[PDB]
């Protein structure tokens, strides 16, 4: 129930509600049925503030969803350059594939984020 509340907190973008729920001993790596962690959700919706605090509370940076997508894949696809950069600094797997064998660099290119794709291509 604390895990479910933390996913919603991360999704909605409620910085203080995440901090409280983490400090109340919520699982920072709480998957749903689709294998989606708080970090995936925060990465998907561009909540840098929350991405930083989840990582600082020991989030798995290379957590895979049910279809093999990582927080870097989501950040890359959704055009969130600063979150992409922060995840890389936190040791994100830059050449990681999903089920369909596509890197974050591929997803960045797919969504027409060449700027971000270039950042990911320079880093290994």
């Amino acid at each position: 129930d604390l895990g479910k509340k933390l996913l919603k907190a991360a999704q909605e973008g409620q910085d203080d509600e995440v901090r409280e729920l983490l400090k109340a001993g919520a699982d920072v790596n709480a998957k749903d049925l689709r294998g989606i962690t708080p970090l995936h959700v925060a990465a998907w919706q561009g909540h840098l503030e929350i991405v930083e605090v989840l990582l600082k509370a020991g989030a798995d940076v290379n957590a895979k969803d049910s279809k093999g997508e990582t927080p870097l894949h989501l950040a890359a696809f959704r055009g969130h350059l600063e979150i992409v950069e922060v995840l890389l600094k936190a040791g994100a797997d830059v050449n990681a594939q999903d089920q369909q064998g596509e890197t974050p660099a591929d997803l960045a290119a797919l969504a027409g984020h060449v700027d971000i794709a270039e950042v990911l291509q320079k880093a290994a």
């Binding site: 689709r34 998907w44 919706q45 696809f77 997803l107 797919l110």
Partner: protein
């Protein structure tokens, strides 16, 4: 509570006064109540798009002529060989003497031993086709 109400073709989103948003281009949600939209399979060159991606359903794909799908949902493509060939690492090699392949994919298999069932070779085999057993 506010995400359960989200349909397919859509993801849960409470940042900007909307309850749910539509799946962005080249992504889809096949269930409702999804926190994130899954990414569309892309298919060009060797891969040919059979079903196009929708907001609510993934693209499906086959391989272009001269190739064939391998693995669930055509994960990767493999080169077709001729009949009476198999695909070695060196490439499309013809079948050895006592062995045949009636398909344009897979390994050479040995001819049927008619003796096993008691029968006799009615028609001889070849690289292209198996023995026909008789009496």
């Amino acid at each position: 509570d506010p995400c359960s109400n989200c349909p397919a073709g859509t993801f849960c989103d409470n940042n900007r006064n909307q309850i749910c948003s539509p799946c962005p281009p080249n992504s889809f949600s096949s269930a409702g109540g999804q926190r994130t939209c899954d990414i569309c399979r892309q298919c060009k060159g060797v891969f040919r798009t059979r079903k196009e991606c929708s907001s609510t359903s993934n693209a499906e794909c086959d391989c272009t002529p001269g190739f064939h799908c391998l693995g669930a949902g055509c994960s990767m493509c493999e080169q077709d060989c001729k009949q009476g060939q198999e695909l070695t690492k060196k490439g499309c090699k013809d079948c050895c003497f006592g062995t045949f392949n009636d398909q344009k994919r897979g390994i050479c298999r040995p001819w049927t031993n008619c003796s096993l069932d008691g029968k006799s070779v009615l028609v001889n085999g070849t690289k292209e086709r198996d023995v026909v057993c008789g009496p």
